[PDB]
């Protein structure tokens, strides 16, 4: 009733998740003007990595569609 | 082979029972009686009010489920002929062989 929910503000400001990238993304490399060099890692055959490549990380590996987790020393 | 006739009200129950007697007692069938079941009653007690004001005044809603059974030993072709009756909609028919 009389108690109004006011901003006590210990937590001043927070923002929503905004996906930002570069202008274009080149996953490939041109060798001999027509042969493609693969730089990033594919995903093994679990009906996920037919066109999905893995993301670089310090010690992990991650698939895009079905979220396959890989790790190697 | 028995047939259960279960109706909503006793007047239409007795009317469809008298129609079954009038359509069954002329053939060569030893017709057993319409065995009277005890009347079932679903008693529901209701506060009568959405908010708590006044005395404890309660609605008492009841139904009167009336059930009858008949026994007719016959081949199964005769039972399907007897079953075809222009019947009151408040009457339910079950068969058991």
């Amino acid at each position: 009733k009389r108690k109004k929910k006011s901003y006590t503000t210990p937590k001043k400001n927070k923002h929503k998740r905004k996906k930002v990238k570069l202008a274009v993304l080149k996953y490939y490399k041109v060798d001999e003007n027509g042969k493609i060099s693969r730089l990033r890692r594919e995903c093994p055959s679990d009906e996920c990595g037919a066109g999905v490549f893995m993301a670089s990380h310090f010690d992990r590996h991650y698939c895009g569609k079905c979220c396959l987790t890989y790790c190697f020393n | 082979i028995r047939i259960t006739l279960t109706s909503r009200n006793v007047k239409s129950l007795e009317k469809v029972c008298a129609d079954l007697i009038r359509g069954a007692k002329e053939k060569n069938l030893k017709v057993k009686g319409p065995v009277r079941m005890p009347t079932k009653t679903l008693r529901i007690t209701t506060r009568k009010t959405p908010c708590g004001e006044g005395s404890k005044t309660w609605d008492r809603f009841q139904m009167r489920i009336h059930k009858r059974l008949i026994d007719l030993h016959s081949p199964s072709e005769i039972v399907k002929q007897i079953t075809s009756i222009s019947i009151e909609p408040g009457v339910e028919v079950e068969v058991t062989i």
Binding site: - | L42, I44, R47, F61, Q62
Partner: protein, 51 residues
């Protein structure tokens, strides 16, 4: 994303009425789901009389 926790398979919250999704007042177990305020109005339609 955690959408559905607290499975609500029992008790008062699991009982969702047939009339207006009311859950504060009790819902009877007679093969019936009413709000006890609309049951008075609708008993003459579902087949209950006062006697």
């Amino acid at each position: 994303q955690l959408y559905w926790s607290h499975p609500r398979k029992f008790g008062q919250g699991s009982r969702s009425c047939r009339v207006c999704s009311n859950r504060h007042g009790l819902i009877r177990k007679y093969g019936l789901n009413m709000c006890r305020q609309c049951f008075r109005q609708y008993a003459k339609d579902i087949g209950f009389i006062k006697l």
